[PDB]
Symmetry: C3
Subunit: 108 residues, 3 copies
C-alpha cells in the first residue's frame, strides 16, 4: 500500500480530520513541524540585501492507506485543507514495502 504525508495549516486541522473521518480513514498520526512557502528580498544599509525565509507552524499527518484509498484520502485532504493562500501545505504519496500491526504481530 501507500504512506501519505501531508502538511496542513494548523487552523485547518479539524476540517481535515472531519473530512478524513467521512472518508473512512481512521488511524493516522500527526505532529507539528515548521514549513515554508514564501520569502521577501530585503535591501539594507549594512550588508544591503538579504533574503527573508519564513517558517510556519504546520501539522504533518502520516496516514498509511491502501491503494483504493489514496485518491479518496488525497481528495479529502486537498479539499479539507485548501485555502487558496500561500502556505496551504503539501501532500506526498509514498511507496510502502510492508506494514506490520505491532499488536497482532502481523501485517494489514
Amino acid at each position: 500500500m501507500k504512506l501519505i504525508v501531508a502538511i496542513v495549516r494548523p487552523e485547518k486541522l479539524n476540517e481535515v480530520l472531519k473530512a478524513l473521518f467521512q472518508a473512512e480513514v481512521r488511524g493516522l498520526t500527526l505532529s507539528r513541524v515548521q514549513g515554508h512557502g514564501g520569502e521577501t528580498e530585503r535591501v539594507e544599509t549594512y550588508r544591503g540585501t538579504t533574503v527573508k525565509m519564513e517558517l510556519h507552524e504546520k501539522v504533518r499527518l502520516e496516514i498509511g492507506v491502501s491503494e483504493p484509498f489514496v485518491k479518496p484520502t488525497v481528495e479529502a485532504i486537498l479539499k479539507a485543507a485548501r485555502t487558496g493562500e500561500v502556505g496551504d501545505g503539501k501532500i506526498f504519496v509514498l511507496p510502502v514495502e510492508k506494514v506490520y500491526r505491532i499488536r497482532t504481530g502481523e501485517e494489514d
Copy 2:
C-alpha cells in the same frame, strides 16, 4: 536499503530500544507524534514515539522482529511499523552509501 518507521507506545520505547541494541542497531532517530482515530481515561490524541531506522537488507527482519517483540502488548493502540523503500542513503560525516 530500507527505512523502518516504528510508531510505539512511549511506555515500551525502552524495551524496543534494548531489543534493537542487542540486535545491533544504531543510526536510529526518534520523536513524539500523536495517534488519532475501575475507571476510564479518554483522549482525542495518543502519545506515540516515532522511531526511524535506516537499515540494510540483511537486518530488515531483525529490526522489525526486535520491535514487534518489544512493542506488542495485545491491546489496541500498540502501533505499527512501515518498511519503506530508500533509493540512496548518505552518511553526512564521511559521505557513504550502504550503511
Copy 3:
C-alpha cells in the same frame, strides 16, 4: 519526484537552509528529533524533482559536514505523487 529526508545538527541548521535556498528549494518542512544516549537534531523534509535531487544532496552534504560523529544522514525516497494543496497541481507544478 523524490522525497529527501535529511537529519542535521541544530548548530548547522541555518547553513543548510541557506544552501537549500540556493539549491532553488522553495518548499520544505522541519521538526526536532533525537538521534542515537540521545542527541539533538533537526529533521528536514524536502520534496524535489529529479533534476534537483543530486544537486540538493550535495548542498546539504557540504553545508552539514563538520567531520565529527553525528553529522546526520540524508535519505532519498521514491514518491508516487506530490500535491501542492493551495492549487491542487501535481508534482513539478507543485514545486517552485
